Amino acid sequence: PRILNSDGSSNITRLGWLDDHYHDLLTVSWPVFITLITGLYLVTNALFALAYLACGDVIENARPGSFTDAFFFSVQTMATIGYGKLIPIGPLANTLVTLEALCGMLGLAVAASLIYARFTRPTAGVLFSSRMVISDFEGKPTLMMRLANLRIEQIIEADVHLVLVRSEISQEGMVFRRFHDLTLTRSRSPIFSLSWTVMHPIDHHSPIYGETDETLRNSHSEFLVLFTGHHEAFAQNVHARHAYSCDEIIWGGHFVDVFTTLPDGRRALDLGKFHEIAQHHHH
Amino acid sequence: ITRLGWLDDHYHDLLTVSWPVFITLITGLYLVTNALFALAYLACGDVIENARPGSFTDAFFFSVQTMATIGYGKLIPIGPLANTLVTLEALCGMLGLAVAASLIYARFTRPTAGVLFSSRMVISDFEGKPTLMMRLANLRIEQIIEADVHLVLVRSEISQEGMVFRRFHDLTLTRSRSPIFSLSWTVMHPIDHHSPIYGETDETLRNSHSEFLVLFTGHHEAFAQNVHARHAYSCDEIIWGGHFVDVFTTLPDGRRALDLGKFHEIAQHHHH
Ligand SMILES: [K+]
Ligand SMILES: [K+]
Ligand SMILES: [K+]
């Protein structure tokens, strides 16, 4: 019954048409977005076709009072193919033409913006260790997990936040979910390129100090990781988030080493080991 | 390593104008330039195929067909002069589009933080000290990263020189940063000997004609772009002793939920 999913998205039921037009257009699935555009596209042409027919027989070589011909003319005119069979006739016909033209290009301008707006989004090639572990590092128990860069390109001034979210009781007895940012031994990595094992030493200042497993479940506590940095691939900022529940903490565990030796003998990175955690089993 | 796995502020004005007007401006410019070009054509004189001699309409409409590059084919350039004007217009047309597009995109690509502000603030005991607070709710499924908020008191004061003006006090929040704002955030300004509103009653707040300004900003994942939102409270929108109700619920299913209805609800003790 977790508050936060693995993907980092909160896991809650929200309780609440043209209101949020811009957001919606960027939020919709490509299929739908294209459909919407198409719909609008056809629609307006039909509208214009009617405008033409309304004037009546104002298009060269058009079957009298036929919507098809008018519609197709309308597209040839708005897309500015303008083949040349169907042609405007008289002031009314033509004014509608120069109006449509403008409309066509404006549509393109709007379409383009939308396309570019939804198209130009990078994604940090970052993978999160499926688990966290708590183990002795440098003489103090330390909470940790690790990121692996999935691309050849590097991420500059990358940095990461490890935030504990758990329930608390105030002196006044208010019961709330609070956020604790956990001091990391290393929060900045000016050049993140392969793997980074993040660590939160646990001492008298750690909000999880002298805390067992039982105690973590009891505060219904989770752990949220936010990574961000500047990806050279895209020459633009990227970010990635991930969340762990109390039960994804492997106590006593140690992340295996991803750095391996081949028959060639050169050091290599194996992403397979990335999720592997060493563990002592004591019967 | 081997991986195994009037014309002064033109730009501002163009972005600031209402869509109706902006489209009009564009349209105006559009028609205008075509008329200009039409004249250029007529100026040469009868240089367009199938054009009624010395008729502006024909020239104008030709000009549009040429600049929008429909180029139907009835009206056609004739001779060097006609055509040069053509290849000139063409260029002009596309450039216009490039400019129009930029403008369109520039004014079109403006996200809005899906953020809702609690209609009221409250002053109540939290963690053993009276605390001023209000709360934000994210109205979208998408998350806002490194979100942060400013709580600024604005009130009247006296200078040593005795100027009675309006000053800004940023109020220390127990939590000013939220790297991941996703549902609801209750912002708090503990009131102690350092709070500009320390040992202040309601009467005293009205007296300084004091208000409270909230600025929220953060990076919205929806738009992959920065967003912001501002809100303001007057002295009388402070509910003394009040406590924001809880928006969280456990469903019958045992699954957590958020009710935005409760969001504006403030608990209160009435003592006859
Ligand atoms: K064309
Ligand atoms: K064409
Ligand atoms: K043609």
Short mmCIF file of C-alpha atoms in Angstrom, two decimals, chain A residues 28-221:
data_model
loop_
_atom_site.label_atom_id
_atom_site.label_comp_id
_atom_site.label_asym_id
_atom_site.label_seq_id
_atom_site.Cartn_x
_atom_site.Cartn_y
_atom_site.Cartn_z
CA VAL A 28 -1.83 13.96 -25.06
CA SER A 29 -0.41 10.83 -26.73
CA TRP A 30 1.10 11.37 -30.19
CA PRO A 31 -1.66 9.30 -31.82
CA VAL A 32 -4.35 11.52 -30.30
CA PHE A 33 -2.41 14.74 -30.91
CA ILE A 34 -2.05 13.93 -34.61
CA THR A 35 -5.75 13.01 -34.69
CA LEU A 36 -6.73 16.31 -33.09
CA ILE A 37 -4.62 18.17 -35.62
CA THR A 38 -6.05 16.09 -38.47
CA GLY A 39 -9.59 16.63 -37.21
CA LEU A 40 -9.07 20.38 -36.96
CA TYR A 41 -7.42 20.27 -40.40
CA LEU A 42 -10.30 18.50 -42.17
CA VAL A 43 -12.92 20.42 -40.19
CA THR A 44 -11.69 23.90 -41.17
CA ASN A 45 -11.41 22.89 -44.83
CA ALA A 46 -15.02 21.70 -44.78
CA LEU A 47 -15.96 25.03 -43.21
CA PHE A 48 -14.12 26.89 -45.95
CA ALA A 49 -15.65 24.66 -48.62
CA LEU A 50 -19.07 25.69 -47.34
CA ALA A 51 -17.93 29.31 -47.49
CA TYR A 52 -17.17 28.75 -51.19
CA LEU A 53 -20.41 26.94 -51.99
CA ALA A 54 -22.21 29.68 -50.02
CA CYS A 55 -21.08 32.10 -52.72
CA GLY A 56 -22.14 29.54 -55.30
CA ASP A 57 -20.29 28.11 -58.29
CA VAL A 58 -17.24 30.36 -57.79
CA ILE A 59 -14.63 27.72 -58.64
CA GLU A 60 -13.42 26.87 -62.14
CA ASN A 61 -13.99 23.27 -63.25
CA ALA A 62 -15.97 22.45 -60.11
CA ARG A 63 -19.03 20.23 -60.37
CA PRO A 64 -21.89 22.65 -59.57
CA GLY A 65 -22.86 22.66 -55.89
CA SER A 66 -20.66 19.70 -55.00
CA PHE A 67 -19.05 19.73 -51.57
CA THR A 68 -16.28 17.29 -52.51
CA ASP A 69 -14.90 19.53 -55.25
CA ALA A 70 -15.15 22.57 -52.99
CA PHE A 71 -13.49 20.72 -50.11
CA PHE A 72 -10.62 19.42 -52.21
CA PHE A 73 -10.18 22.85 -53.76
CA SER A 74 -10.09 24.23 -50.22
CA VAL A 75 -7.21 21.92 -49.30
CA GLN A 76 -5.28 22.68 -52.51
CA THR A 77 -5.76 26.33 -51.64
CA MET A 78 -4.96 26.20 -47.89
CA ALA A 79 -1.99 23.85 -48.33
CA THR A 80 -1.21 26.16 -51.22
CA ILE A 81 -0.63 23.26 -53.67
CA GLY A 82 -3.09 25.14 -55.84
CA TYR A 83 -2.90 22.67 -58.75
CA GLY A 84 -4.74 24.95 -61.17
CA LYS A 85 -7.79 23.00 -62.34
CA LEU A 86 -10.02 24.48 -59.65
CA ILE A 87 -9.56 28.25 -59.58
CA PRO A 88 -11.26 31.17 -57.81
CA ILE A 89 -13.82 33.20 -59.77
CA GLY A 90 -14.77 36.76 -58.83
CA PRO A 91 -13.93 38.94 -55.80
CA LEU A 92 -15.78 36.81 -53.23
CA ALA A 93 -14.09 33.55 -54.27
CA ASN A 94 -10.61 35.09 -54.19
CA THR A 95 -10.98 36.99 -50.90
CA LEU A 96 -11.87 33.68 -49.29
CA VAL A 97 -8.71 32.36 -50.96
CA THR A 98 -6.28 34.97 -49.60
CA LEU A 99 -8.00 34.48 -46.26
CA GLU A 100 -7.57 30.71 -46.29
CA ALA A 101 -3.93 31.01 -47.32
CA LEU A 102 -3.18 33.17 -44.25
CA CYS A 103 -5.18 30.71 -42.14
CA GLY A 104 -3.20 27.78 -43.54
CA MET A 105 0.20 29.25 -42.68
CA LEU A 106 -0.99 30.38 -39.24
CA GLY A 107 -2.13 26.83 -38.61
CA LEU A 108 1.32 25.60 -39.56
CA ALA A 109 2.91 28.13 -37.19
CA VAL A 110 0.69 26.86 -34.37
CA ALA A 111 1.20 23.21 -35.29
CA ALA A 112 4.97 23.70 -35.48
CA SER A 113 5.18 25.34 -32.05
CA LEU A 114 3.17 22.48 -30.57
CA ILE A 115 5.24 19.84 -32.36
CA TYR A 116 8.52 21.44 -31.27
CA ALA A 117 7.19 22.02 -27.76
CA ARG A 118 6.31 18.36 -27.19
CA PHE A 119 9.13 17.02 -29.39
CA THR A 120 12.06 18.78 -27.67
CA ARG A 121 12.04 16.80 -24.43
CA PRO A 122 15.72 15.03 -23.21
CA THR A 123 15.71 12.10 -20.80
CA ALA A 124 18.63 11.49 -18.47
CA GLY A 125 19.96 8.09 -19.48
CA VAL A 126 20.00 7.33 -15.77
CA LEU A 127 19.24 3.94 -14.20
CA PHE A 128 18.49 3.53 -10.49
CA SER A 129 19.57 0.56 -8.41
CA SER A 130 16.35 -1.36 -7.75
CA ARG A 131 17.22 -1.49 -4.06
CA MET A 132 18.87 0.52 -1.32
CA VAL A 133 21.14 -1.04 1.28
CA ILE A 134 22.22 -0.20 4.80
CA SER A 135 25.76 -1.34 5.62
CA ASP A 136 28.98 -0.38 7.39
CA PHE A 137 31.09 2.00 5.33
CA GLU A 138 34.05 3.82 6.88
CA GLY A 139 33.09 2.83 10.43
CA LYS A 140 29.47 3.98 10.46
CA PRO A 141 26.31 2.34 9.13
CA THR A 142 25.45 4.02 5.83
CA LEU A 143 22.34 4.04 3.67
CA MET A 144 23.08 3.90 -0.06
CA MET A 145 21.91 3.29 -3.58
CA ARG A 146 23.50 3.92 -6.97
CA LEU A 147 22.94 5.49 -10.40
CA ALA A 148 24.33 4.25 -13.71
CA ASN A 149 24.61 6.47 -16.80
CA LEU A 150 23.13 4.52 -19.72
CA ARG A 151 24.70 6.62 -22.47
CA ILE A 152 28.21 7.31 -23.72
CA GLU A 153 27.62 11.04 -23.30
CA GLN A 154 28.44 12.65 -19.96
CA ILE A 155 26.34 14.60 -17.47
CA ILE A 156 27.99 17.71 -16.02
CA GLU A 157 27.46 19.20 -12.55
CA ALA A 158 25.13 16.29 -11.82
CA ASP A 159 23.72 16.19 -8.29
CA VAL A 160 21.29 14.10 -6.29
CA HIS A 161 18.87 14.47 -3.38
CA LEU A 162 18.03 11.65 -0.98
CA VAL A 163 14.77 12.55 0.76
CA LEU A 164 13.17 10.47 3.49
CA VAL A 165 9.38 10.88 3.65
CA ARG A 166 7.69 9.55 6.79
CA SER A 167 4.83 10.22 9.20
CA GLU A 168 5.41 12.41 12.25
CA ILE A 169 3.54 13.51 15.35
CA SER A 170 3.79 17.07 16.58
CA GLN A 171 3.82 17.98 20.27
CA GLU A 172 0.34 19.35 19.57
CA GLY A 173 -0.41 15.90 18.18
CA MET A 174 -0.78 16.73 14.50
CA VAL A 175 -0.01 13.63 12.38
CA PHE A 176 1.64 14.63 9.08
CA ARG A 177 3.90 13.34 6.32
CA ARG A 178 7.17 15.25 6.40
CA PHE A 179 10.25 15.44 4.22
CA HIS A 180 13.81 15.03 5.48
CA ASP A 181 16.68 15.70 3.10
CA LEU A 182 19.44 13.29 4.11
CA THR A 183 23.03 14.54 4.20
CA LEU A 184 25.02 12.70 1.54
CA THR A 185 28.79 12.17 1.80
CA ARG A 186 28.78 13.35 -1.81
CA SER A 187 25.88 15.37 -3.25
CA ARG A 188 27.68 16.92 -6.24
CA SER A 189 29.46 15.17 -9.08
CA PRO A 190 30.70 17.77 -11.57
CA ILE A 191 31.27 14.95 -14.06
CA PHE A 192 28.94 11.96 -13.87
CA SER A 193 29.86 9.51 -16.62
CA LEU A 194 29.57 5.86 -15.53
CA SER A 195 28.33 4.87 -12.07
CA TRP A 196 27.75 6.81 -8.85
CA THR A 197 27.07 5.19 -5.50
CA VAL A 198 25.28 7.74 -3.31
CA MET A 199 25.67 7.46 0.46
CA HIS A 200 23.91 8.83 3.52
CA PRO A 201 26.02 8.09 6.60
CA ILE A 202 23.79 7.32 9.59
CA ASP A 203 24.86 9.14 12.77
CA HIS A 204 23.22 11.12 15.58
CA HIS A 205 22.08 13.66 12.95
CA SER A 206 20.48 11.24 10.48
CA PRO A 207 16.66 11.24 10.76
CA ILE A 208 16.96 7.45 10.48
CA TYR A 209 19.48 7.15 13.33
CA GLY A 210 19.11 4.11 15.56
CA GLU A 211 16.17 3.00 13.44
CA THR A 212 15.37 -0.66 12.79
CA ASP A 213 13.25 -2.11 10.02
CA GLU A 214 10.20 -2.35 12.28
CA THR A 215 10.46 1.37 13.04
CA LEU A 216 10.62 2.31 9.36
CA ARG A 217 7.46 0.43 8.42
CA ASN A 218 5.80 2.03 11.44
CA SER A 219 6.29 5.60 10.19
CA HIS A 220 5.18 4.34 6.78
CA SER A 221 8.45 5.86 5.58
#
